[PDB]
Amino acid sequence: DVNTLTRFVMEEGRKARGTGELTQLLNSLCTAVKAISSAVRKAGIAHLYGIAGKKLDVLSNDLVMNMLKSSFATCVLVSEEDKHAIIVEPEKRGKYVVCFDPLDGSSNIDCLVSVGTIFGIYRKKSTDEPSEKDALQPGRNLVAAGYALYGSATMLVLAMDCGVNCFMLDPAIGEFILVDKDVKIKKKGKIYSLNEGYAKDFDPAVTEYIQRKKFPPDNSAPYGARYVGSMVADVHRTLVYGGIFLYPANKKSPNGKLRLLYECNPMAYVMEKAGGMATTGKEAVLDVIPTDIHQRAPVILGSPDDVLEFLKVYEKHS
Amino acid sequence: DVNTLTRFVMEEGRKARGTGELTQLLNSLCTAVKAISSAVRKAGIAHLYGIAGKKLDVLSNDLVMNMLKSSFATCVLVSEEDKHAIIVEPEKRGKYVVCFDPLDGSSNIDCLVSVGTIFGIYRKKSTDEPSEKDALQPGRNLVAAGYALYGSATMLVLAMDCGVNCFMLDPAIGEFILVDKDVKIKKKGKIYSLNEGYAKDFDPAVTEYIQRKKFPPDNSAPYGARYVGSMVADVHRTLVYGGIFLYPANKKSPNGKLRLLYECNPMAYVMEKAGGMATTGKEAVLDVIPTDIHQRAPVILGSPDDVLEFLKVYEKHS
Amino acid sequence: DVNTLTRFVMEEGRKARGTGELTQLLNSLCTAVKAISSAVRKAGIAHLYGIAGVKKLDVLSNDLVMNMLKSSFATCVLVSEEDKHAIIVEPEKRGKYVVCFDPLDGSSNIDCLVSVGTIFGIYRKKSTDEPSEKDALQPGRNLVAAGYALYGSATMLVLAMDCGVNCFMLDPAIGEFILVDKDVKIKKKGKIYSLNEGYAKDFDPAVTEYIQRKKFPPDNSAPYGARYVGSMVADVHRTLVYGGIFLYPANKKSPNGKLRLLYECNPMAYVMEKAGGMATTGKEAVLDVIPTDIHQRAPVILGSPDDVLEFLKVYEKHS
Amino acid sequence: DVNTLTRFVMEEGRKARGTGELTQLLNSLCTAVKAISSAVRKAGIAHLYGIAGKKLDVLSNDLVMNMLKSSFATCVLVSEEDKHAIIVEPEKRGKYVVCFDPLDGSSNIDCLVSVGTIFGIYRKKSTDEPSEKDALQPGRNLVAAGYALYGSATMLVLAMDCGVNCFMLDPAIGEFILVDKDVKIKKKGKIYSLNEGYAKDFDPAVTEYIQRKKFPPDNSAPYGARYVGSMVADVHRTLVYGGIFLYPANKKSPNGKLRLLYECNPMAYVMEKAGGMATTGKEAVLDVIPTDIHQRAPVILGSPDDVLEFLKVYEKHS
Ligand SMILES: O=P(O)(O)COc1cccc2c1-c1ncsc1C2
Ligand SMILES: O=P(O)(O)COc1cccc2c1-c1ncsc1C2
Ligand SMILES: O=P(O)(O)COc1cccc2c1-c1ncsc1C2
Ligand SMILES: O=P(O)(O)COc1cccc2c1-c1ncsc1C2
């Protein structure tokens, strides 16, 4: 029996016996994603080049922003594109807070590399007039999170308390088809992913770990290397093939480079629900209590046995 | 003045004042690429999942094969998917020979990583009955070559004697729109791309070069690292952002992993026409005279100053 | 504030405070319509013609609606022009709704690329017995929802419920039905009459006189314009948008008409009434006819109120 | 062997051994039709309705106009949209003249009725400066003509000296697939098409003919009636199913309502090449020598036996 994202979310929402808000929120996000996908695949670019005589990131942000506001399910929106959290006007407020990167990897879009949309959904915990403070909850409080990968094909990975599910976007009918139910990452992988250009600045623990991947002390087979540069792409490969992904702090970016609210937490949540791990080295990413909506955070995630191995090396250096 | 691949190829073909065969050949390939793109983006996948109640590689190979045969411009077809060269039936023979990888990076199409179609076109030099021998020409003989990148968006890079041009596929109207005329790679880049998992088996020259990229002896800024795993994707980034791409040889692989006829030469051709370089370490990729249609060849390509620097290190170890 | 069919139905469903079944049913139907639309516009036809080196559209359309409805868990009895007998949903997928539909109306003529569509009518099962064909035998007046999908120059879904009629345009770029017409109402009177005049020789005197009054206004007004696509979905939609009258009456050879009551007449009748129009068989409101056979025929005259009313006056003159 | 509009036109053009202009013109028209089709099916309408926070006929006219001008194959363009013929700037002139209706039936598009694009191509005869005079040639001089039907599916019917061919537009890959070679209309049909609302003003000949279709002389079965209102739709059904289409001159418009240059001639040309007929009642539509680019002309076309029958009745009343 075929299943779509819409049908899936409707059912899960019905079971929850709530207001139906989250269902509306996700429906809206889904529509936005479809819109972004169309734009990312360059639909209509011929008109831009004069067949008949705004930047992608901006448009993407506008789509998510507008669809979420018009859902009546949110009150506070935090986006990679905006400096301050956006407070939904009173007549359209809902109980959810959403953090997202409308178009991840958009900086290197020129080369047509994969790009994506990452999102994390929280329930407003505070009772004060909505404000940026409502977005400062530890990832552990996420009600739902996931991403949309705009690669060879467009896929939306949705993670909720009940697990992780993958939907393929069928461009023929603009419908997200469920193709992977209750997904689980491999216990251990054979791929490590990180920008080794920072080798000169790596922390000793990271240096040793990578070393153990290239020169297994047990003469096992060396891990293969892959690094697309687009977090959505790299994390998704990790989920599918297993392995490990890293963007640790550089002595140049002491607090890591990736953002906690809309890049780290969402991926961390997806990994954990899929049976994987996500650490900053010192603690689980999901446990970090944010103080600034755009704060950075180091992150090592992927197959449990792999993350655990890194942690062993991390401790050896602490 | 908007320009499409069809219009462009028709005009360049008209100027050549020939049979018009190459024009037909490229038109055919173009249609095939659009077909592949549709399939790659999962159009119709809902039917595969029972909405109404087997492989991409094979389908892609069938599309290029049939479109090329039906163009009446080819006589010998060499495909990464086929063990032997395909000899076009007599009643559909043309004067061109085409070598191609219908779906490059397909081994990893499961994580939705970018994939592409690489192609190289030669003119049959002999009148002997068409045979695999006609595909054994040095890349320097290429009449045209390029690739189709199925990434965030689908793009077709076409290189001919007159230069390199990039066309973006507008899904809305199924038309390839010219968006980059007479492209030229940067003289020097800041990105190095290769699977460092093979570090343990690297040739000393490769090891030292990568080391100079991570720890510049002149204390310059270290190069950034990127490696998608899909040649089309990696080479295209190199073209767009500049830098260097490597898939070198070592003791266990005296001649590399990538294939000369349909992976190395096409990319080598594109690079040279764009002002870049492509070496095997011992000589220009395009100068290698093939003896086997599926023979492998080591390859280092990209920005000239970068390839030249590699060659300096290579020589140091020779 | 942009609005989509999915958002709209979810909202209306939430307000109803029910099981959420109808919401799932409509979502499913909507997905099916998108699928049919894709097929109707010939997506992938290149493969059928050997680009790489395959059933009829009506069949496929029927399969899509059938499967999407069954898989919704909101239905128990499905009636389609395609199947002779009502389909009883297996026990593990039963819902409380009954659906009558024509998966691809006008399909008898898709070779000329004429407009085609999907008509649907939704009823609530009103029995405590094992689901059967009998549950589809309710007068149109019992409809909970009904409408159609028009596959014309663009694909549009007209949805009529107790709260009114709303039109959604299908944006192929994102596969989303965008609300472009809220609480639609047909014109009080139109200037277009639609029917196959080829059957002139067999027309009922009332029909003959009426058409005559449209071509030669007695009060010397301007004669009505004529339009007849042949595809009910197309002709009814034009009537809705431009007003006027549409007819497929009974004749000598066809005493009860040609169109089907359950999935062609009732749905359209329901849509017209909710939009302020009328739908009569000549003897009574289409919606009031109590069916006895799921595939029974019924004559139908529908459209602008003043126009249907005028026909009725002529009909009575001949009774 | 699959065949596309592009491949077909390139081959026929090559055989003609000419400048290649007509090939470029048709390619351009083809791309424009795809663009119009996308617009007609409402692609992107969501943005029009604020998903992210000009008229179809105008856009359609702009697309054809620009694509034709940029083909370098035209010099004089006549469109229903413009009052005066458009003279192509000197630096983009070709030897062809094109008359067209960018979006036929656009007046009643609000009901989603079928719409289409009609076109007629002539070769500039004269040697003087291009002017409106160059579009005043009898249909008999057409080099090519046809239309694009935007119905349940988009189809382009192309008629040239070698016959009539039909191409289905595959939205998945934006390619026109040849699905009907050297088409021929039925010798006689069973459908008559015309707006009977004008009954009160019909010419006696028309009245009698219609009468013979509803109450058959040879005891035969009455013809079925169909009238969409969109010429492109009605003419296409006639071509496919055979029969007759009429828009005669009543008492009011003594010259008919349809336009000769871009509505009647193109259709007339298509019919004749398909073995059908097209008369004004007094003479073959293609034989009428125009004096005004927007002049009207009565027209009765379709199956030969049907047109012939009309003519017999027409003469009885003359
Ligand atoms: O937002 P509400 O409708 O008040 C509650 O919705 C939920 C409460 C708990 C768990 C889930 C949902 C929910 N809504 C849609 S999917 C899903 C999973
Ligand atoms: O195949 P022919 O028409 O005989 C020769 O075509 C060419 C000969 C030389 C250079 C070019 C072409 C050609 N054909 C299409 S683009 C292009 C560039
Ligand atoms: O199927 P139920 O959820 O039990 C009842 O649904 C309804 C009951 C009355 C009115 C409406 C709906 C409904 N469901 C979706 S839109 C809409 C309008
Ligand atoms: O415009 P030219 O290439 O100089 C002449 O083209 C033709 C001359 C006669 C007949 C045909 C063509 C032509 N060009 C494309 S299809 C087709 C049929």
DSSP assignments along D221-262, one per residue: PPPEE-B-S-HHHHHHHHHHH--EEEE---SSSTT-SSBIII
Put residue C298 in one of left, alpha, beta given phi > 0 → left and psi -120 to 50 → alpha: beta
Q: Which of A161, A182, A203 marks a domain boundary?
A: A182
Alpha helices in A49-193 (DSSP H): 56-69
Token pair of B242 as six digits: 């500049």
Asked if residues D282 and D254 have their Cβ atoms less than 8 Å apart, the reply is: no
A26: nearest CA partner in chain C: C7
For ligand 4, atom 2, the nearest C-alpha belongs to: D18
User: How many Å apart are CA B147 and CA B158, to the nearest integer?
Assistant: 7
Question: What is the spatial order of strands in the sheet that D144-150 belongs to?
Answer: D86-87, D74-79, D93-104, D115-123, D144-150, D154-160, D163-170, D175-180
Q: What are phi and psi of B93, to 5 degrees?
A: -75, 140
Three-state DSSP class for residue A156: strand
Q: How far is the CA of B99 from the centre of ligand 3 (A)?
A: 60
Question: Is C201 in the same domain as C84?
Answer: no
Pairing of strands C278-280, D244-247: unpaired
User: How many Å apart are CA A11 and CA A5, to the nearest integer?
Assistant: 10
Token pair of C200 as six digits: 């002139």
How many CB atoms are located within 10 Å of the residue C111 CB? 10
Question: Is A14 in the same domain as A130?
Answer: yes
All residues of chain D having their beta carbon less than 8 Å from the beta carbon of residue B34 are 173-175
CA end-to-end span of chain A = 52
Cβ(B78) – ligand 2 distance below 6 Å: no
Any binding-site annotation on A296?
A: no
Residue D256: CATH number of its domain: 3.40.190.80
Q: Tell me the C-alpha to C-alpha distance, in Å, between residue D53 and each of B82, B209, C2.
A: 51, 51, 8
Q: Considering all CA atoms of chain D, what is the largest pairwise distance in Å, rounded to the nearest integer?
A: 65
Q: How far is the CA of C163 from the centre of ligand 1 (A)?
A: 27
Q: What are phi and psi of C68, to 5 degrees?
A: -65, -40
Q: Tell me the C-alpha to C-alpha distance, in Å, between residue D42 and each of A207, D36, D147, D178, D241.
A: 55, 10, 20, 25, 29
Listing DSSP states for D101-130 in one string gives: EEEETGGGGGGT--EEEEEEEEE---SS--
Q: Residue holding tokens 């998510």?
A: A64
Asked if residues C35 and A173 have their Cβ atoms less than 8 Å apart, the reply is: yes
Token pair of B301 as six digits: 């390509």
User: How many Å apart are CA A62 and CA D116, to the nearest integer?
Assistant: 35
Write b or e for each residue in D147-176: b if 16 or more Cβ atoms lie within 10 A of its Cβ, otherwise e: bbbbbbbbbbbbbbeeebbbbbbbbbbbbb
Question: Is D26 in the same domain as D166?
Answer: yes
Pairing of strands D115-123, D93-104: antiparallel
Q: Give the residue from B91, B60, B95 showing the smallest Cα distance to B74.
A: B95
Write b or e for each residue in D62-75: b if 16 or more Cβ atoms lie within 10 A of its Cβ, otherwise e: bbbbbbbbbbbbbb
Question: Is C85 in the same domain as C197?
Answer: no
Enclosing H/E stretch for C212: helix C205-215
* Closest atom of ligand 1 to CA, residue A22: 1
Among C23, C97, C183, the mutation site with the greatest number of ligand 3 atoms within 8 A of its Cβ is: C23
User: How many Å apart are CA C261 and CA C232, to the nearest integer?
Assistant: 13
Minimal Cα–Cα distance from D120 to chain A, Å? Answer: 20
How many CB atoms are located within 10 Å of the residue C54 CB? 5
* Closest atom of ligand 1 to CA, residue A9: 16
Token pair of D304 as six digits: 């030969």
Asked if residues B180 and B281 have their Cβ atoms less than 8 Å apart, the reply is: no
Report residues whose beta carbon is within 6 angstroms of any ligand 4 atom.
D 9, 12-13, 16, 18-23, 160-161
Token pair of D72 as six digits: 């370098």
Cβ(B20) – ligand 2 distance below 6 Å: yes
Q: Considering all CA atoms of chain B, what is the largest pairwise distance in Å, rounded to the nearest integer?
A: 65
Q: What are phi and psi of D79, to 5 degrees?
A: -130, 145
Asked if residues A73 and A94 have their Cβ atoms less than 8 Å apart, the reply is: yes
- Helices C57-70 and C21-40: crossing angle in degrees, nearest 10, is 160
All residues of chain C having their beta carbon less than 8 Å from the beta carbon of residue B32 are 51
Q: What torsion, rounded to 10 degrees, do the Cα atoms A39, A42, A44, A50 define?
A: 130
Q: What is the span of the domain harbouring residue D98?
A: 1-182
User: How many Å apart are CA B85 and CA B102, to the nearest integer?
Assistant: 14
How many CB atoms are located within 10 Å of the residue A121 CB? 25
Three-state DSSP class for residue C98: strand
D105: nearest CA partner in chain C: C153
Q: Which ligand is nearest to the CA of C20?
A: 3
Burial of D289 (0-12, 13-18, 19+ CB in 10 A): exposed
Per the DSSP assignment, residues forming a β-bridge with A164 are A159
- The experimental technique behind this entry is X-ray
User: How many Å apart are CA A238 and CA A236, to the nearest integer?
Assistant: 5
User: How many Å apart are CA C98 and CA C89, to the nearest integer?
Assistant: 10
Question: Is D216 in the same domain as D163?
Answer: no
- C-alpha triplet C229, C230, C234: angle, nearest 5°: 60
Q: Give the residue from C175, C174, C156, C153 showing the smallest Cα distance to C166.
A: C156
Residues 15-34 on D with a CB inside 8 Å of A are 31-32
Q: Tell me the C-alpha to C-alpha distance, in Å, between residue C110 and each of C56, C58, C116, C152, D152.
A: 10, 9, 7, 12, 8
Q: Is A154 on the interface with B (CB under 8 A)?
A: yes
Asked if residues B69 and B97 have their Cβ atoms less than 8 Å apart, the reply is: no
Put residue B77 in one of left, alpha, beta given phi > 0 → left and psi -120 to 50 → alpha: beta
Q: Give the residue from D175, D137, D176, D167 showing the smallest Cα distance to D269.
A: D137
Three-state DSSP class for residue B69: helix
Contacts of C156 (CB under 8 A, 6+ apart): C149, C150, C167, C168, C169, C170, C237, D112
Q: What are phi and psi of C245, to 5 degrees?
A: -140, 140
User: How many Å apart are CA A186 and CA C2, to the nearest integer?
Assistant: 42
User: How many Å apart are CA C35 and CA C30, to the nearest integer?
Assistant: 9
Instruction: For chain C, give the number of residues.
Output: 319
Question: Is D175 in the same domain as D200?
Answer: no
Asked if residues D94 and D109 have their Cβ atoms less than 8 Å apart, the reply is: no
Write b or e for each residue in C21-44: b if 16 or more Cβ atoms lie within 10 A of its Cβ, otherwise e: bbbbbbbbbbbbbbbbbbbbbbbb
Listing DSSP states for A239-292 in one string gives: HHH--EEEE--BTTBTT-SSBIIIIIHHHHHHHHHTT-EEE-SSSBGGG---SS
Three-state DSSP class for residue A235: helix
Alpha helices in A136-223 (DSSP H): 204-214
User: How many Å apart are CA B164 and CA D29, to the nearest integer?
Assistant: 27
User: How many Å apart are CA B271 and CA A227, to the nearest integer?
Assistant: 23
All residues of chain D having their beta carbon less than 8 Å from the beta carbon of residue B38 are 172-173
Rg (CA), chain B: 20
Q: What are phi and psi of B241, to 5 degrees?
A: -100, -10
For ligand 1, atom 13, the nearest C-alpha belongs to: A13
Instruction: For chain D, give the number of residues.
Output: 318
Is D43–A46 a contact, with Cβ atoms under 8 angstroms apart?
Answer: no
Q: What torsion, rounded to 10 degrees, do the Cα atoms B37, B41, B43, B49 define?
A: 140
Q: Give the residue from A243, B165, C50 showing the smallest Cα distance to D1.
A: C50
Is B170–A110 a contact, with Cβ atoms under 8 angstroms apart?
Answer: no
For ligand 2, atom 5, the nearest C-alpha belongs to: B18
Count CA within 13 A, CB hemisphere, residue C145: 19
Write b or e for each residue in D252-283: b if 16 or more Cβ atoms lie within 10 A of its Cβ, otherwise e: eeeebbbbbbbbbbbbbbbbbbbebbbbbbee
Residues 255-314 on C with a CB inside 8 Å of D are none
User: How many Å apart are CA A157 and CA A143, to the nearest integer?
Assistant: 14
Q: How far is the CA of A163 from the centre of ligand 1 (A)?
A: 14
CA A222 to centroid of chain Cα atoms: 28
Three-state DSSP class for residue A83: coil
Enclosing H/E stretch for A157: strand A154-160
Contacts of A168 (CB under 8 A, 6+ apart): A153, A154, A155, A176, A177, A179, B42, B45
Q: Tell me the C-alpha to C-alpha distance, in Å, between residue D205 and each of B157, C196, D238, D313.
A: 63, 21, 21, 6
- Helices A204-214 and A304-316: crossing angle in degrees, nearest 10, is 130
Burial of A254 (0-12, 13-18, 19+ CB in 10 A): exposed
Asked if residues D247 and D237 have their Cβ atoms less than 8 Å apart, the reply is: no
Put residue D241 in one of left, alpha, beta given phi > 0 → left and psi -120 to 50 → alpha: alpha
Burial of C5 (0-12, 13-18, 19+ CB in 10 A): buried
Enclosing H/E stretch for D59: helix D56-69
Rg (CA), chain D: 20
* Beta carbon pairs, B and C, within 8 Å: 38
User: How many Å apart are CA A192 and CA A285, to the nearest integer?
Assistant: 19
Q: Give the residue from C169, C43, B172, C35 showing the smallest Cα distance to A38.
A: B172
Count CA within 13 A, CB hemisphere, residue D256: 22
Is C173–D44 a contact, with Cβ atoms under 8 angstroms apart?
Answer: yes
Q: Tell me the C-alpha to C-alpha distance, in Å, between residue B74 and each of B25, B94, B287.
A: 7, 4, 24
Q: Which of B182, B214, B237 marks a domain boundary?
A: B182
Alpha helices in chain A (DSSP H): 5-16, 21-40, 45-48, 56-69, 204-214, 231-241, 265-273, 304-316
Q: Which of C183, C205, C225 marks a domain boundary?
A: C183
Is the four-CA dihedral A11, A13, A16, A20 of positive or negative sign? Answer: negative
User: How many Å apart are CA D192 and CA C210, to the nearest integer?
Assistant: 21
For ligand 3, atom 8, the nearest C-alpha belongs to: C16
Question: Is A191 in the same domain as A178?
Answer: no
All residues of chain D having their beta carbon less than 8 Å from the beta carbon of residue B173 are 31, 34-35, 37-38, 174
Q: Give the residue from A77, A57, A199 showing the smallest Cα distance to A132.
A: A77
Question: Is B288 in the same domain as B161?
Answer: no
Single-letter residue type at C81: E
Cβ(A145) – ligand 1 distance below 6 Å: no
Question: What is the spatial order of strands in the sheet that A175-180 belongs to?
Answer: A86-87, A74-79, A93-104, A115-123, A144-150, A154-160, A163-170, A175-180
Asked if residues A29 and A119 have their Cβ atoms less than 8 Å apart, the reply is: yes
Minimal Cα–Cα distance from C319 to chain D, Å? Answer: 26
For chain B, what is the domain count? 2
Residue A61: CATH number of its domain: 3.30.540.10
User: How many Å apart are CA B199 and CA A222, to the nearest integer?
Assistant: 9
Any binding-site annotation on B198?
A: yes
Question: Is A166 in the same domain as A258?
Answer: no
Contacts of C305 (CB under 8 A, 6+ apart): C186, C188, C189, C276, C277, C278
- C-alpha triplet D150, C225, C210: angle, nearest 5°: 130
- Helices C266-274 and C232-242: crossing angle in degrees, nearest 10, is 10
Question: Is B152 in the same domain as B231?
Answer: no
Q: Give the residue from A5, A13, A120 showing the smallest Cα distance to A74.
A: A120
Alpha helices in chain B (DSSP H): 5-16, 21-40, 45-48, 56-69, 204-214, 231-241, 265-273, 304-316
Q: How far is the CA of A25 from the centre of ligand 1 (A)?
A: 10
Question: Is A173 in the same domain as A55?
Answer: yes
User: How many Å apart are CA D73 and CA D68, to the nearest integer?
Assistant: 7
Question: Is B31 in the same domain as B87?
Answer: yes
- C-alpha triplet C17, C21, C23: angle, nearest 5°: 80
Q: What are phi and psi of A160, to 5 degrees?
A: -135, 180
Q: Give the residue from C304, C280, C35 showing the smallest Cα distance to C189.
A: C304
